[PDB]
Amino acid sequence: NLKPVDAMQCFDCHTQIEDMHTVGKHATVNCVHCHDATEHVETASSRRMGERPVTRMDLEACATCHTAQFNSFVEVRHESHPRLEKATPTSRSPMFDKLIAGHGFAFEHAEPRSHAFMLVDHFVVDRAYGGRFQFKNWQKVTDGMGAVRGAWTVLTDADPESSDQRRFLSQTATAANPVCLNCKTQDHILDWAYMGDEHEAAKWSRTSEVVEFARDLNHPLNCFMCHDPHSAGPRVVRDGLINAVVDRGLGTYPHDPVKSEQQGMTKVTFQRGREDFRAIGLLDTADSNVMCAQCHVEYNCNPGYQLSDGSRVGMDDRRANHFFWANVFDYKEAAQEIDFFDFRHATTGAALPKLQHPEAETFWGSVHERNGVACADCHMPKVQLENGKVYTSHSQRTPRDMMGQACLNCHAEWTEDQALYAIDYIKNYTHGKIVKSEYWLAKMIDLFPVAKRAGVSEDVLNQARELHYDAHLYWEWWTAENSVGFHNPDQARESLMTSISKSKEAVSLLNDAIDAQV
Amino acid sequence: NLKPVDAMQCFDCHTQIEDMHTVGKHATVNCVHCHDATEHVETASSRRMGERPVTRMDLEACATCHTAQFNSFVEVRHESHPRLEKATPTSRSPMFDKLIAGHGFAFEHAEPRSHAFMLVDHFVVDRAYGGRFQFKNWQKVTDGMGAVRGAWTVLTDADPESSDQRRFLSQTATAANPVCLNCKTQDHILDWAYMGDEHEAAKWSRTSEVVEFARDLNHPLNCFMCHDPHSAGPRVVRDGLINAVVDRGLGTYPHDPVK
Amino acid sequence: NLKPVDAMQCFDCHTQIEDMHTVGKHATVNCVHCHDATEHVETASSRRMGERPVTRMDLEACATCHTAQFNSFVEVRHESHPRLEKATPTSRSPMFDKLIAGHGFAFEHAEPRSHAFMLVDHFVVDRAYGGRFQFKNWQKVTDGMGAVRGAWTVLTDADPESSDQRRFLSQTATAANPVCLNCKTQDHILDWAYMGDEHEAAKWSRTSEVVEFARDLNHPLNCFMCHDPHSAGPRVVRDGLINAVVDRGLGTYPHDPVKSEQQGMTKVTFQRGREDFRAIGLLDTADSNVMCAQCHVEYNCNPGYQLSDGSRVGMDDRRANHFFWANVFDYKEAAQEIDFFDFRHATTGAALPKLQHPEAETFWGSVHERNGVACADCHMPKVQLENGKVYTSHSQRTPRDMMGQACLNCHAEWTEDQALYAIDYIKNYTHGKIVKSEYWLAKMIDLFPVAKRAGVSEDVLNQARELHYDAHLYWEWWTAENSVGFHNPDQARESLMTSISKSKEAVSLLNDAIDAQV
Ligand code: HEC
Ligand code: HEC
Ligand code: HEC
Ligand code: HEC
Ligand code: HEC
Ligand code: HEC
Ligand code: HEC
Ligand code: HEC
Ligand code: HEC
Ligand code: HEC
Ligand code: HEC
Ligand code: HEC
Ligand code: HEC
Ligand code: HEC
Ligand SMILES: [C-]#N
Numbered sequence A, C: 001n002l003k004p005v006d007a008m009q010c011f012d013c014h015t016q017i018e019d020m021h022t023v024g025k026h027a028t029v030n031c032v033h034c035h036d037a038t039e040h041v042e043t044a045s046s047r048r049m050g051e052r053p054v055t056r057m058d059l060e061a062c063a064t065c066h067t068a069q070f071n072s073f074v075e076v077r078h079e080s081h082p083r084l085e086k087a088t089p090t091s092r093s094p095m096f097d098k099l100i101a102g103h104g105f106a107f108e109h110a111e112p113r114s115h116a117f118m119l120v121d122h123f124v125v126d127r128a129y130g131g132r133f134q135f136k137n138w139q140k141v142t143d144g145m146g147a148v149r150g151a152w153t154v155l156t157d158a159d160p161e162s163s164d165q166r167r168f169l170s171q172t173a174t175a176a177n178p179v180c181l182n183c184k185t186q187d188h189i190l191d192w193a194y195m196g197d198e199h200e201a202a203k204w205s206r207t208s209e210v211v212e213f214a215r216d217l218n219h220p221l222n223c224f225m226c227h228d229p230h231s232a233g234p235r236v237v238r239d240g241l242i243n244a245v246v247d248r249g250l251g252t253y254p255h256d257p258v259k260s261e262q263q264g265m266t267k268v269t270f271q272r273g274r275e276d277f278r279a280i281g282l283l284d285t286a287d288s289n290v291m292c293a294q295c296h297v298e299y300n301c302n303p304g305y306q307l308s309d310g311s312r313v314g315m316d317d318r319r320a321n322h323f324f325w326a327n328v329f330d331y332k333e334a335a336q337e338i339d340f341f342d343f344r345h346a347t348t349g350a351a352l353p354k355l356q357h358p359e360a361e362t363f364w365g366s367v368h369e370r371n372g373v374a375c376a377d378c379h380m381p382k383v384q385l386e387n388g389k390v391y392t393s394h395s396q397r398t399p400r401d402m403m404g405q406a407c408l409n410c411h412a413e414w415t416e417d418q419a420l421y422a423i424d425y426i427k428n429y430t431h432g433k434i435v436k437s438e439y440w441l442a443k444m445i446d447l448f449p450v451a452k453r454a455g456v457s458e459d460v461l462n463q464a465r466e467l468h469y470d471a472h473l474y475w476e477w478w479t480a481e482n483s484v485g486f487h488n489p490d491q492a493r494e495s496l497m498t499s500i501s502k503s504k505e506a507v508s509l510l511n512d513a514i515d516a517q518v
Numbered sequence B: 001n002l003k004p005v006d007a008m009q010c011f012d013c014h015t016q017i018e019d020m021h022t023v024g025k026h027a028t029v030n031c032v033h034c035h036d037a038t039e040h041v042e043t044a045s046s047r048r049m050g051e052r053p054v055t056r057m058d059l060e061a062c063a064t065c066h067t068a069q070f071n072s073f074v075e076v077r078h079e080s081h082p083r084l085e086k087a088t089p090t091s092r093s094p095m096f097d098k099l100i101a102g103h104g105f106a107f108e109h110a111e112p113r114s115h116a117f118m119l120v121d122h123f124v125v126d127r128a129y130g131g132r133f134q135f136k137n138w139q140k141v142t143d144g145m146g147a148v149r150g151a152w153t154v155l156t157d158a159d160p161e162s163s164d165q166r167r168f169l170s171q172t173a174t175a176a177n178p179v180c181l182n183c184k185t186q187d188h189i190l191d192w193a194y195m196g197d198e199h200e201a202a203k204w205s206r207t208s209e210v211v212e213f214a215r216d217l218n219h220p221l222n223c224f225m226c227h228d229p230h231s232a233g234p235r236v237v238r239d240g241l242i243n244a245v246v247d248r249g250l251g252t253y254p255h256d257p258v259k
């Protein structure tokens, strides 16, 4: 059985913790629930850690007092199809292989599934670790609670004796790097300096051997990513988000300075040896838009190249961990701002961006966002009980499973079927424009080999490559973004029509140039 | 927000509680969750209570950390038909009125329904308080969570100015007495001596005015009836049961001495 | 009403039948249930047949004493979509037409449906008989019991006055030949010599006019294909299977000599005029793996060409009726062993294999096969009754319709939804790799015309053709195989990654060669 410790003894040194813990709703929660610090207390000084205390990062540390929220979080949505490749005719991007050629996502890019699986899915996807990590067997794919208990309870490593990234299976890639893990787990929260910069107190950084880092990590989406364990108050912990909002002064709502002030973020820094080490962002309100934006954003978490001279930008560079914090129509400028692109297209040679799941930046300026609606209202609503204590559902999933709470309490004029119909109108329309955008991208791409072999000039090919950047950006935003336009239907429409326009321009350019060589 | 108290100071005078609390699974649960003892600590000695500390009896004192158990408890089973009289041809005892004639249950004996309603149902049944207590209106019969929050949030008293048992409706009885309440609530656990014997320290006893007692009671089936709040371990609190099992030496399983 | 005959009179001549009938569970079943032999008994000698007895091949011969098994067999699974073409974006092989160009399957290749329809579906598919045979009208497609009663109760022939294979509809082929019928019916079991070799006692053989043969055949999947009618014991009758297992000594489990001995096959030969004529394979156990492998295998049942010199291999050659009895990684060697390929690709010119439904060979070595599980456990389980005599379901179909019996009695740790989720994880992953394999095959194929027209050398084109063989094999196995990887997920993964690797090699080869000509 747990035996409480004297928190006043800790507070003698830990004044920041005192200030947070004594005031919030965890003022009665003893440190022993999450820390084993006996040897630490025997050896520490006011400025030197001494023996390092044990800190629990497992989600079951919160589940004995918050079982309802834990059990809701760990539920597996079986209707969220697992390991479903997006580059197929029945998924999100039928022509993805042709369009993404040259990028690691060509090796595998599946649709997302329930949050319990995020860390194991990261470890086992074919693009990440060369096939090094696999489920122990094909039964384990069902085991959401097991994944939550720990990744290494359900996975194997093909070679525990080596730590290099290499291919164990032929059609895999080794794109994983330490930055990725920040959106899968925060088990490393005490072992990683802010931004992954080199730091004498950090075991891990942007330049670490990612296979070694992986082996030290266990739990997905820790409860403390959104809730400070000491104050119980709302927060974020993701460095790239704090960097955008606070360090670069862009605010929580870059398009709305008033909402940014009302729903702001305060950066709190913790030190090692009286040097800044790590940071958190305390929120003014329990604002899920910003909580979810720790991960559901467009980012850099990877090496790339400079737009200016084509030189390599490695993991050592700050730009390898970057939140652009820009909507689709501001993105090209944001990428120019840091002089960065992701890959050269394998067929066209164009410098291209790689977009990823920009839900937060897409939601900005939408009708729902402008009306004060937030991610949680549609994706983790309050539970409705005939008789009971209300709590917030932590099963983050499509509103289709809980339409009464997610939509119909606000939209009293609609039945469930009417609300579903409105979602599908947008998704069907948007998907049609995604498909047409891909058709035109593909038509352009297929002209590049013909143009090159016919002797079309480098100047014309470069003009077409410049068009390819924009045609790509204004399409791929929407295959990356998970709502198929629902989050901002007018923006999707405008973007996708722009993509098509750019590809059509490039097709005309290249056809005319080819025809002139004949 | 709750601010913790120095439990070690309490333990200087409460060794009995110390020995339970420090060993069980509530060793880390601070006393402020269930007690307001500030004025008590200012005035007590080890031999003089001083000001009486307040003890929470509401079930929400436990629901903060044990929401799943609380929400499962308070659920209303709508399929358990409510206010269904047993002396009818389609229930348990078609000839009950003839057979029970002379007993108070002839006035009303319904089938049981969900636990959330036990205290309110005891208060409102036609055989208990002469019809003195009623739901505020006929809508309130659905409200299990409200009954749990407290009986007097959903009921009315026909005459707050009197405390005698009497008939307010013609075909009622006044069979309720203080012993009944021990199987409806334990809000009175610190105000009732063992067995309801007379005692200098007990506000309430077997011989109390049941209408006065009723007004001091709020919550059904308290969580601590089965779980010691200090050790978190399994227990019973009902005096009659302890008296049979232990005092009279009958054991927990009178037909099986080994068990 | 049936009147029994004196079986002892038959047994005077038919000692093999006596030995089987008197010992098994049909010892009390009189011959009149299946044979009308009165004139035969009047005219036969110990060595000459005399007048031929009538033998019932209809399944209703078994249905008066085994109605439960018959009615379960003839059930139509309406959820098994009928006449659904695989070369469509929503089915198994979105790029099949490009990849299979030059082969008859380009004319039509539908997904399988319920067993009742196998013979009629064979007769009416657009690739088989030039459109000669059709359902009497479009209502008849529903009539499973009617098809079982006889094909010619529900079909018409466009020209009863001719027996040649020809096109009656423009976009049909005439690929059917007599070997095909052995996996649709055994109505011809007394009229077909072992392997379809020429034989004086056989009405039909590999070289027969298939339209004439077709007209003599009526019933699908006869009950006696798995059960000897005389002993009632487990058996196979399919010649190609017996040839692989017994004649070529490969065993019932080629990868496991111990299991092969425990679960073996004994070849029993019947003669005409004291010359070997036909054969059956009695099984040691009621082993559905081997029963189902009469048909659910990769085979030759068709003419082809030799790998060595390109010469034609006709129906007259034994190789036209062949069970390779080899897993995907042993297949190329098995095809080299008989010096055979199926077709030349219409665009690339490569010699290619044609694969068909290799469920048995894929199942070998899988986790389930290694644990002693067999096809029937998942596809025709025992019925579970609260009160009743248990029998074996004969409705061979997906386990999704009977998950409690097919999966959950063994997998007590799972709910139905969890088990379904595990199936879909494998199928989704495998299908993604099938689609990627097709993308890379298509990319290679499309380079052949460009390379040929640019003047790339025959030596380079032949190197690419050799790669095409392997890229094709390691893809097509899996579009042919019906489990979308479930039967052997690790093997599918390895094969499909090999396909992609081979195509990528060919693409690089051809692009570099084209670029060198410019
Ligand atoms: C003064 C002698 C200290 C006492 C008393 C306690 N801690 Fe401490 N701790 C101390 C230092 C100098 C540091 C390094 C950071 C800093 O503020 O300079 C720490 C660090 C921790 C940590 C972080 C550990 C890690 O892995 O990074 C934890 C979780 C921690 N301390 C907890 C803790 C507890 C619970 C205490 C009471 C039992 C306690 N500390 C006392 C110095 C001192
Ligand atoms: C029991 C010993 C607890 C442990 C372990 C954890 N929490 Fe907690 N939490 C506890 C209490 C008694 C309360 C107050 C309840 C009330 O409403 O009065 C809380 C509160 C929270 C909250 C709400 C905070 C707010 O609204 O300001 C959150 C978000 C929360 N707790 C989160 C949480 C996390 C993430 C935990 C694991 C790190 C955790 N709690 C543990 C009691 C206990
Ligand atoms: C936060 C800014 C992220 C970083 C850094 C990385 N990932 Fe991610 N990932 C993130 C989200 C919000 C999602 C769900 C939404 C979606 O569009 O999928 C994902 C999903 C994945 C998946 C599952 C789906 C798939 O693509 O197969 C995998 C396998 C995955 N992520 C891997 C991965 C890798 C290898 C990363 C570093 C190169 C990486 N992620 C970083 C958020 C974020
Ligand atoms: C960010 C993605 C979150 C993670 C990770 C966790 N929770 Fe959460 N929690 C989140 C939100 C948006 C809210 C609602 C805030 C609002 O006021 O609208 C909550 C709330 C809670 C609470 C408070 C009581 C309630 O409303 O249910 C608790 C006790 C709580 N959360 C606990 C908790 C646990 C145990 C988690 C890990 C399993 C967890 N949260 C993760 C957002 C996020
Ligand atoms: C709720 C979770 C509680 C916590 C935490 C503490 N106490 Fe308690 N206490 C609680 C109840 C419901 C009662 C009523 C009696 C019962 O057995 O249920 C009590 C009673 C006491 C008493 C009176 C004992 C007696 O002589 O009759 C004392 C002296 C007391 N409690 C002290 C105490 C201390 C010092 C605590 C912190 C260490 C403490 N309690 C916590 C409920 C809860
Ligand atoms: C949070 C501040 C709590 C309050 C208020 C209450 N309980 Fe509790 N309880 C709490 C914890 C951290 C634990 C240990 C969890 C673990 O498994 O480690 C418990 C445990 C219990 C138990 C189980 C005891 C056992 O198995 O020995 C019970 C029966 C229990 N708690 C009951 C209970 C009651 C009735 C409460 C109101 C009087 C109550 N708890 C409050 C945390 C908290
Ligand atoms: C514990 C030994 C009890 C005592 C003392 C009293 N009651 Fe009770 N009551 C008890 C239980 C276990 C049940 C449910 C099972 C059942 O057979 O009903 C009840 C039920 C009631 C009801 C509801 C049903 C009904 O009869 O209408 C009422 C109105 C009720 N009890 C009233 C009541 C009165 C007036 C009591 C003292 C005279 C009394 N109860 C004592 C357990 C116990
Ligand atoms: C609006 C046109 C109503 C319709 C339709 C129904 N009810 Fe009603 N009900 C309505 C009002 C304005 C009130 C009084 C509210 C108050 O607190 O003053 C009620 C009351 C009831 C009651 C309580 C009756 C009592 O005597 O205490 C019940 C049990 C009730 N209503 C149930 C009910 C049912 C089941 C209905 C559909 C058959 C129904 N009501 C319709 C307003 C309206
Ligand atoms: C000896 C005079 C015979 C008697 C008595 C019966 N049969 Fe016969 N049968 C005989 C021969 C020589 C042959 C040819 C095969 C052989 O063993 O050499 C047969 C063949 C059959 C067949 C196969 C017919 C076909 O179409 O190929 C059947 C089904 C058959 N015989 C059945 C049968 C029955 C049921 C008899 C008792 C009524 C019977 N035969 C007697 C020789 C002799
Ligand atoms: C009635 C006159 C029968 C006819 C016609 C057919 N079968 Fe039969 N069969 C019959 C009996 C009395 C039995 C024995 C039942 C028992 O369990 O004792 C059987 C048995 C079978 C079996 C099981 C054999 C075994 O387990 O060893 C099979 C597979 C079987 N029968 C198949 C079958 C076939 C395919 C038939 C048509 C060719 C057929 N039977 C006809 C009775 C009768
Ligand atoms: C046994 C080794 C077989 C031979 C010889 C032939 N077929 Fe077949 N066929 C067989 C199986 C096990 C299946 C079901 C599984 C599947 O993948 O479809 C089939 C299916 C068909 C179908 C229906 C599906 C379709 O392709 O449209 C048809 C029309 C069909 N078979 C025709 C056919 C022809 C023309 C054959 C000789 C050239 C032939 N089959 C041989 C097993 C076997
Ligand atoms: C009576 C008013 C009818 C309605 C309503 C439907 N059908 Fe019909 N159908 C009808 C007749 C008289 C016939 C021809 C019968 C014959 O054998 O001469 C049919 C035929 C069909 C067919 C076959 C078409 C073919 O070209 O062979 C089909 C597939 C069919 N019917 C299906 C069908 C459906 C699905 C209906 C509801 C949408 C439907 N029919 C209505 C008469 C009538
Ligand atoms: C191979 C593809 C089969 C065909 C064709 C038929 N049956 Fe079958 N049968 C098959 C198996 C795998 C089994 C189970 C064997 C085991 O021991 O696990 C059976 C069993 C029977 C039985 C025995 C009683 C029972 O278990 O139900 C009978 C009587 C039977 N089969 C009859 C039968 C009929 C009438 C068929 C044509 C409609 C038929 N079988 C075809 C495999 C195969
Ligand atoms: C008992 C007769 C079984 C039947 C029926 C089904 N399965 Fe099975 N399965 C069984 C065993 C003994 C094992 C291996 C267990 C171990 O850990 O050693 C399995 C394995 C699986 C797997 C994993 C496959 C892999 O290659 O890792 C899966 C996905 C699986 N089983 C699913 C499954 C399904 C969906 C079933 C119904 C169609 C099914 N199994 C039946 C035993 C038995
Ligand atoms: C992840 N991207």
Ligand SMILES: [C-]#N
Pocket (backbone or CB within 6 Å): C356
């Ligand atoms: C069939 N093939």
Ligand SMILES: [Ca+2]
Pocket (backbone or CB within 6 Å): A080, A081, A111, A112, A113
């Ligand atoms: Ca999903």
Ligand SMILES: [Ca+2]
Pocket (backbone or CB within 6 Å): A298, A299, A300, A354, A355, A356
């Ligand atoms: Ca990006």
Ligand SMILES: [Ca+2]
Pocket (backbone or CB within 6 Å): B080, B081, B111, B112, B113
């Ligand atoms: Ca009841």
Ligand SMILES: [Ca+2]
Pocket (backbone or CB within 6 Å): C080, C081, C111, C112, C113
């Ligand atoms: Ca099918």
Ligand SMILES: [Ca+2]
Pocket (backbone or CB within 6 Å): C298, C299, C300, C354, C355, C356
């Ligand atoms: Ca073949």
Ligand code: NA
Pocket (backbone or CB within 6 Å): A079, A080, A081
């Ligand atoms: Na989905």
Ligand code: NA
Pocket (backbone or CB within 6 Å): A131, A132, A133, A134, A156, A157, A158
């Ligand atoms: Na491995």
Ligand code: NA
Pocket (backbone or CB within 6 Å): B079, B080, B081
């Ligand atoms: Na009932």
Ligand code: NA
Pocket (backbone or CB within 6 Å): C079, C080, C081
């Ligand atoms: Na199907």
Ligand code: NA
Pocket (backbone or CB within 6 Å): C131, C132, C133, C134, C156, C157, C158
């Ligand atoms: Na016709």
Ligand code: NA
Pocket (backbone or CB within 6 Å): A446, C446
């Ligand atoms: Na093309």
